[PDB]
Design a protein around this ligand. Sequence first.
Ligand SMILES: CC[C@H]1OC(=O)[C@H](C)[C@@H](O[C@H]2C[C@@](C)(OC)[C@@H](O)[C@H](C)O2)[C@H](C)[C@@H](O[C@@H]2O[C@H](C)C[C@H](N(C)C)[C@H]2O)[C@](C)(O)C[C@@H](C)C(=O)[C@H](C)[C@@H](O)[C@]1(C)O
Lengths: 55, 7, 114, 209, 122, 118
Amino acid sequence: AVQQNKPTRSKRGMRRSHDALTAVTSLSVDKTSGEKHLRHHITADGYYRGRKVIA
Amino acid sequence: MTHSMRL
Amino acid sequence: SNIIKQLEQEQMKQDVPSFRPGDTVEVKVWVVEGSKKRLQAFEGVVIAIRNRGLHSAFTVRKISNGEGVERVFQTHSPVVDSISVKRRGAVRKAKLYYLRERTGKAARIKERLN
Amino acid sequence: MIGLVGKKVGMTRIFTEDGVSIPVTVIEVEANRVTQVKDLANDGYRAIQVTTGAKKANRVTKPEAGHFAKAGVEAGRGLWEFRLAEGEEFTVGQSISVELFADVKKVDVTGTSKGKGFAGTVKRWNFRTQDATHGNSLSHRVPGSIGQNQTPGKVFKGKKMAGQMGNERVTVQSLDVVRVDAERNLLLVKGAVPGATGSDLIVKPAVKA
Amino acid sequence: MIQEQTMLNVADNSGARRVMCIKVLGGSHRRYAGVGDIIKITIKEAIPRGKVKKGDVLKAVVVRTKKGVRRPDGSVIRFDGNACVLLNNNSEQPIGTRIFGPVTRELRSEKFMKIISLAPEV
Amino acid sequence: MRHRKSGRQLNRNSSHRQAMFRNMAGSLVRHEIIKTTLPKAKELRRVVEPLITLAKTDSVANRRLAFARTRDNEIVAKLFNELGPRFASRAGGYTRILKCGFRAGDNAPMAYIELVDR
RNA sequence: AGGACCGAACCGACUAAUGUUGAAAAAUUAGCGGAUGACUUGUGGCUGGGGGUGAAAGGCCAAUCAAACCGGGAGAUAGCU
RNA sequence: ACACAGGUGGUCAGGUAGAGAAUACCAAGGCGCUUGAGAGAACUCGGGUGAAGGAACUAGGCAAAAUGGUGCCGUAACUUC
RNA sequence: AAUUCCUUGUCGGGUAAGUUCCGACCUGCACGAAUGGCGUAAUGAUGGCCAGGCUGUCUCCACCCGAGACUCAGUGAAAU
RNA sequence: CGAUGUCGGCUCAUCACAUCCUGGGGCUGAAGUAGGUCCCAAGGGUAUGGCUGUUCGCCAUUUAAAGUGGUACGCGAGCUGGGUUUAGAACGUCGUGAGACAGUUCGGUCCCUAUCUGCCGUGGGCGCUGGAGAACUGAGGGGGGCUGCUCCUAGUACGAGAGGACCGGAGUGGACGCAUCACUGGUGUUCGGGUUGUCAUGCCAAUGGCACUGCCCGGUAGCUAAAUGCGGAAGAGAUAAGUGCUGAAAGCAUCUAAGCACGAAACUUGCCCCGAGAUGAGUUCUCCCUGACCCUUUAAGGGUCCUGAAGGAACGUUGAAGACGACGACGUUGAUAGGCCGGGUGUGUAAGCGCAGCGAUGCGUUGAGCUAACCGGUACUAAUGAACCGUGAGGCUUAACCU
Ligand SMILES: CC[C@H]1OC(=O)[C@H](C)[C@@H](O[C@H]2C[C@@](C)(OC)[C@@H](O)[C@H](C)O2)[C@H](C)[C@@H](O[C@@H]2O[C@H](C)C[C@H](N(C)C)[C@H]2O)[C@](C)(O)C[C@@H](C)C(=O)[C@H](C)[C@@H](O)[C@]1(C)O
């Protein structure tokens, strides 16, 4: 189980290359609020498709 | 503990 | 779905008699001994019925001369000729596997007279 | 000859008049329509390409819409191709029913089987489980020895190990056909064919005589 | 599903009462035997006036199982207690004069036709 | 291998899962809107909505089955007095799922689940 | 009445599994033996290094025992690495 | 060595079934064991059930399954009675 | 034979088949009388064998329930 | 020797031929059947138990056969630890004695989270020279190849009878692989019921918690084998040994020197699966973009504004797909999931009420009531309008071509 001899910065960097976090594409602009939110999530203040559902 | 050891 | 049940609605036979589990029944099966065929009797007690439409089966249990036999029957099969109830039993459990266990006076059960 | 694609819809059983209860499988063989005929001119070999079913107009793309509107055929889900064995031909768009399979007696099925997922070796390669007691320690269903020693010094290529089992295309050959219904667009074959209900069974006449 | 080391009860009046299957015959690595199958047996208990004694080794034929035969309609005939009928080890004809309890229909071919000619029910 | 198996396990044993869905259904029928995790909300649909289907017809034995399912008296009182006739005309779909960000602590997919009268 | 019987507390440690950079430098889980005695335990004493103690294994003597630990001769000596 | 599944002597000891300070569920009283959320592959750990056969496994019935209480009937060789 | 090499001695029982078990015979390499001999009811988490019951130990594995494994968020080792 | 862990068993094996069976042939002191001996042949197959720590062996019973060998006397970072070979103890024996014994007997810790190669799967990047979506060709690789019994031929050829075929045709078995739940079944701690204890909802009735799902009884859908379907080929080529035809060399003779034809489960195809990262990067079809400027190192250029098409991606409902990515369906011109309704299925006559009985309990309402994963429908809830990536006709030379 024990490693044999230590790998380099390259073989560490190649393995760490695949951990690139990608972002969201773009936030949705709300109709009535104008505020940003994720797609199919409510906003930070509560509007969602023009419907104040939590007030 | 003999089993490994070569006697 | 619907096409399978259409074919199996076509293949089903029409007058099957409904019986509860526990009724002593007289089942007649076609038996083919090569060139000749015959109608052969099997009297026993139904202990398990399974309704699936065309895949309906029911297992009749008969003690013959010394030994218990337990034979299943496909209901809408063309081999099983007719189903004749001899008496209407009065058990309440749906499946009757303790009749496969018990013998004699314990294996006897009530009549319905409902 | 030319196979037919259809939908595997469940299993049932038919009863012969003599007594044999034959367990059959119902393929809804919808009538296929050729959409492209290959020939020796451009391709060197001859083959036809069929399609069937129905598809939403929002669901098709403009490439396949142009390919289907090339020769008179409506959109159908999926595409398949058959090899047109040397002495048979069609006009593009000439529909095929299940009468050519009413002529035949022995048939074979190809289709994508069910997917068992990541399976261990006992499920996959029919291995033998080790002894479940007499001191056995954390090694009930594992394969054990996968090589010899220093003299190979490597695992041979093609070792039977655990991994993906299922979701592959597999075939059953020389199934017996019992009944070829015309007006319901159905075929009934004897016994088990691959895939779960809703599969795309591509059916050919059987090669093994 | 009779395999080796299975205890069987006798069905005929050969003189045995309780035997043990020791090998299913016909093919290598054969696991188990069905109702139309010949198996080798040894005898564990016997009536003292029997035609065979305790500790013989000879062939036998299965006649009954709790697993049961499967008729081509989908029927299955599941008895209670497995049963065998002893056979004259080289000649394969039965020993006893009569046979107790019913048998199966699929058995019916010439040597087992001599078996079913004694049998009370089918 | 769960081919056509339904029901979510939620990393809990079955008796805890049953009592948890009972407590969640109690809080949902009482307060009419809650905030919970997303698969908890989906299986809360699968538990809650037969209770409001049960609550359409007022009888004795149906209220005893409500008391068998949810085990509270104020809950069945509020249910068979209010949410019976308030959901009379419709058919199906009494619960509504909105997803609302993530949980700040352990990064859980959060969701407001509510009854549609409010 | 019993170095009697079955069996909790209590004292142990026969079997298997999990543990093996553990939860733990000796355990846990499911079973197991004794359980009114040649028992077990709380508190306070005493015996000490070629010595103590030992229903006796060369076992224990502060996780160290065919001769404890600590300092000192001592920077022993090493034809050996 | 740790906010360590270990170790630590005394006093009180309720309800129901129980012979009982065992056990099952509870009262007074105290906690939910200082990482959570999904998913429901292999594989391992702890468990449950299983057709027909029943030690064929194997070093060996190891581990599992089974037997289990109260009263009455009955109880062999052998014996130091 | 806790002793026996040759040796799985030969004969008998048990098993379908018994290098182990039991009863014998003496040709005791190399038993033997308080470094005890030969017996022995009871007892043993003791050693060998046999039978009944019971079973996933097995023929031959199959499904299920939980805990890890896998993915995400936080903290974040070690042998080498 | 600053460590290459021993015998045996389990799991998994792979190669060689000096071949055990199956296949082809020669000779036979081969009448037939069955054999003996030798040549070719490695595609496939190759016991179950008793004793023993045993490999080995003996036995019992099968089989077509119970192959021989290599691979650290294959395989312990895969399992066991019975044997040998630690510390306890003992018998025989040797020794004055501590102790000793290829003599025995009883008991006696098997550590590890995989860095790299390897192998099994499954993806991200770029490539493939404008971009995109499909469907294929096939280099190459892999899988599979075992066989018995019976019957016909026929009781024929053969032989004094006794016995009894080659070649060919047919069905049925075993062992193995693949597929699927239609049957028979297992499981089915998400469905129904029975039940002991105990607590709780104020109480009776009715339920629920907890006791391994408390213990049990059935059981849907899935998954599954012991269940059910299937598969080993036929054909073809070049052959190994072998048998040949003609034919000289060598007037003859001769399978060979020139030539021609047969001939095996081996090899190549035929069947199945992967398969254009086959950088040799293949083909066919369809679709989508036909704006301007500047600049100098005038270049296969760098940049600015306008335009972003085909399609992909992201997100959501998700799936008999699935570790995760992937793949598949669907996104209101909508049955993708949940719910509702009808049905199916399973359990077995709910509760309440009445009646009989002193009471447990029973009977009518009642085949009632409740029903998971099933089926067919149903927009009732949840799948939002857009934003993101991808643009602007796609180099040079030679050759034909149409103008
Ligand atoms: C708690 C964990 C302990 O390890 C074990 O218990 C395992 C289970 C031993 O096996 C046990 C059990 C056994 C039978 O062998 C496994 C026995 O023979 C040895 C002596 O002890 C190991 C591995 C032994 O190795 C073996 O030592 C042999 C001398 C050589 C052999 N090698 C050549 C192959 C080697 O693997 C040995 C010496 O203890 C290893 C050294 C590193 C240690 O002393 C360390 C401190 C260990 O005690 C330990 C890590 O704490």
